[PDB]
Amino acid sequence: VKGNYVQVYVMLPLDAVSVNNRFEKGDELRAQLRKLVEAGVDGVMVDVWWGLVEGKGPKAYDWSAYKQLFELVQKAGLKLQAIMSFHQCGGNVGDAVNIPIPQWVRDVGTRDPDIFYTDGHGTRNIEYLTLGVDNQPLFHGRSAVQMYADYMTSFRENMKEFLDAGVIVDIEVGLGPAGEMRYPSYPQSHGWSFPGIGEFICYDKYLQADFKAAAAAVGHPEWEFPNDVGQYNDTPERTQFFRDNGTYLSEKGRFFLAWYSNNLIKHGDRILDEANKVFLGYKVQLAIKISGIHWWYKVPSHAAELTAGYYNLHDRDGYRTIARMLKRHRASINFTCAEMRDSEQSSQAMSAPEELVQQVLSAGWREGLNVACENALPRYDPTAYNTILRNARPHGINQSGPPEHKLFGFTYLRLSNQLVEGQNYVNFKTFVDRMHANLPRDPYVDPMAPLPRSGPEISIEMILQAAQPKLQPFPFQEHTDLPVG
């Protein structure tokens, strides 16, 4: 029965540390976290904002508010998942507060605007630095990858005691906007709204030069980005690229989609190699976040996945390539949409979150990875919780031992007073009993081994072998066998 237990984590508020890098919510959180403990919660997740910590200048790390926050988490007796948040808070759905990346990094952009992901009209997205500059020493002598590595190293040295005490158990490495390994292909600030197909955000000069070099290297130096792709708010049928039997199927289109999605995979791999070196020997799991682009999943072109950088089609598994890249690092996948049913989505959007969830979870498990999930949108109701329960144990309870597959964890978005009062709290507490297979809370479940060094580097051609043949997902039960009631 104990093999069935799934840990439950709760996301702290976006301003758990204030926008001025001070810890102001000690009284409120102490109460709120006591309520989470009373409900059997295993831990919390928190954004560790680059903009707050390295805000005053290069290598001026001010960890003191996060230390106060983390002491409080420890005193409550909860585990902790730390996100290395190298992105801006703001513009993305649910972001109530405003925390840019460091001002001194933005100041570099006033001279070299190509440090930012750039769209086809030339608009600069300031939420994250382009993967184009991962290895370009533009930031007062440092590259973007060096900045990320130094930040993680300073985190390790400063939070060593929380690491040694087994409080911090997971490091989620932010790899893009909203901390997700993707391009900013659906930005509300540039006028996108649901369920627009999005746009390819590869027009910064660094990525343009990368494309020309890749194209010349296959004997097509003339080739350019596709220009029959429409705009943010189009539907697929209204573009020659994404329509049924469109130019996404051409040799040119295929080369472009591979190049764009490959760069994301290489960005993840490089950064995970550095993260693994940092946390070598500590009892933590490294994780990445894959964004849940469920819209247009039901049409042949998977348009919105393609623009986000996920090269996923009926005969090409664009998530198992990513999982295969992660395997050498023993990195986990944190996914989203665990609370969503296809019947809750609008028809127009051609949306299939249930199938997308099944695809990504099955890709992780086939590669031997731990897989965790989050809810995409706020939900307080039994149905949502039952949908999560189904995804947490897709073949139900195993009475003899553990089930064939299960989530390694589930993180709930997001803590507030609303969660810990009234009927909301009764529902949530019941949901946590069910995720624990109705057993008491066990702080020593899922012990981590000392992080081993990443295995040998494999090439992009080796990673891409996972794309085909595309396999059906493992069968999922329609409904959980252990509902909230």
Ligand SMILES: OC[C@H]1NC[C@H](O)[C@@H](O)[C@@H]1S[C@H]1O[C@H](CO)[C@@H](O)[C@H](O)[C@H]1O
């Ligand atoms: O948690 C990742 C992402 N999953 C899909 C949800 O719809 C999004 O709201 C979240 S992003 C959100 O929360 C993150 C973790 O607290 C932040 O890093 C990010 O800035 C927020 O936009």
Ligand SMILES: [Cl-]
């Ligand atoms: Cl296989």
